């Protein structure tokens, strides 16, 4: 059994997005359906439920009046209409099926089938590619690249077009007060290689179609 999840996106505050899940391999109309989310740095949060026959719904206080859950028991789909979006609604969203009864021992109070997760980002920032600055090396040396002031997530970083992987750490992005993200990618290498090996950080930001190859030199 699967719930095949789609939708989401990146929008301005006060705007709207839709999420959808399509049922596969079970009888959709026989089960209550839920949405659950996880915001950055936070735990799982229950969002909403709709009963099997779509006759009753219920919402977390945090989203009541702004999100609308619905289902289509003909197309066997589940929807979450998210209106009036707030920055704190930024999260990975999952759809979830109520667990099965089994003649007494099993309850419907767990979640047995989950959608893969789909990202919703709410921000006043608009799409912007990163600036990329070298972190030049001062037995072991460290060097890196600062990938600054981009939106939205994610960026990808490789070194020497993937040839360098040992010792690489690309840090999670931090959201700056500006609303833009920033991260660093570093690598530690033998001090001997500083003179013979070329180090190039390859930065790709698909939302802005930005690609930067920055050489980092002693």
């Amino acid at each position: 059994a699967q719930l095949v999840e789609s939708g989401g996106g990146v929008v301005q505050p006060g705007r709207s997005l839709t999420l959808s899940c399509a049922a596969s391999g079970f009888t959709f109309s026989s089960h209550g359906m839920h949405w659950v989310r996880q915001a950055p740095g936070k735990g799982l949060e229950w969002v909403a439920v709709i009963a099997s026959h779509g006759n009753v719904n219920y919402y977390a206080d945090s989203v009541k009046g702004r999100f609308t859950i619905s289902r289509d028991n003909s197309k066997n789909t589940l929807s979450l209409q998210m209106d009036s979006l707030r920055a704190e609604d930024t999260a990975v969203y999952y759809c979830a099926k109520e667990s099965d009864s089994c003649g007494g021992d099993c309850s419907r109070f767990a979640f047995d089938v989950w959608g893969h997760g789909t990202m919703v980002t709410v921000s006043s920032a608009s799409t912007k590619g990163p600036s990329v600055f070298p972190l030049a090396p001062s037995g072991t040396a460290a060097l890196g690249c600062l990938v600054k002031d981009y939106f939205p997530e994610p960026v990808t970083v490789s070194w020497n077009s993937g040839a360098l992987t040992s010792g690489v750490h690309t840090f999670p992005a931090v959201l700056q007060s500006s609303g833009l993200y920033s991260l660093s990618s570093v690598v530690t290498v033998p001090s001997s290689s500083l003179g013979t090996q070329t180090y190039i950080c390859n930065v790709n930001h698909k939302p802005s179609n930005t690609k930067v190859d920055k050489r980092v030199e002693p």
Partner: protein, 212 residues
């Protein structure tokens, strides 16, 4: 209903047995489930109705408890058991679910002091109007670390941000970046930039510094 999970982080050696606790603010009978969650993946059901293993879940995960006190036992940590584990409750009406805050399970290893590096702002960034100073703490264990910025001996507050990698798949260490952000104006107003690093693998804290 509030579900309280402890410990916040559970550190286990490979092969070590571990117990995760979930305590409900009032009785929930056996209506208590457990999920495993890894970044970028959907939560994976482990245990239903306090003690029933979800299909396909190996026996090394077991759930116990009733009423207010619940446990998830991992009889011996395997490397891909590193994850955040959540407990969860729901009842008939009202129908909303509640989750515990999560217990992060990580691999325990020997202490490793960080190697520490500092990076002045590049000429390029300076030419672009802002100044970022970066401090790197490389491959340390455990995760607990303290980084403080000083500019001409003045402790900085509110103008730095930290970021930490997930536990390394090969050597089970963490790495950390701390970045101090100043306007170019303020950056050129001062001379000495210093990063003070405290970690239990270090006898006394390490300072890295440079003159602008």
């Amino acid at each position: 209903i509030v579900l309280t999970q402890s410990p916040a982080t559970l550190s286990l050696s490979p092969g070590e047995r571990g117990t995760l606790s979930c305590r409900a603010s009032q009785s929930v009978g056996t209506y208590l489930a457990w999920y495993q969650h890894k970044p970028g993946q959907a939560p994976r059901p482990l245990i239903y109705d306090a003690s029933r293993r979800a299909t396909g879940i190996p026996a090394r995960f077991s759930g116990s408890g009733s009423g207010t006190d619940f446990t998830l036992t991992i009889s011996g940590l395997e490397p891909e058991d590193v994850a955040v584990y959540y407990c969860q409750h729901r009842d008939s009406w009202p129908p909303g679910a509640t989750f515990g805050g999560g217990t992060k399970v990580e691999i325990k290893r020997t202490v490793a002091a960080p190697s520490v590096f500092i990076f002045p702002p590049s000429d390029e960034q300076l030419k672009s109007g802002t100044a970022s100073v970066v401090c790197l703490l490389n491959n340390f264990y455990p995760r607990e670390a303290k980084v403080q910025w000083k500019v001409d001996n003045a402790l900085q507050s509110g103008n730095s941000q930290e970021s930490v990698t997930e536990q390394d798949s090969k050597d089970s260490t963490y790495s950390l970046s701390s970045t101090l952000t100043l306007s170019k104006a303020d950056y050129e107003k001062h001379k000495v930039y210093a990063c003070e690093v405290t970690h239990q693998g270090l006898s006394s804290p390490v300072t890295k510094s440079f003159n602008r």
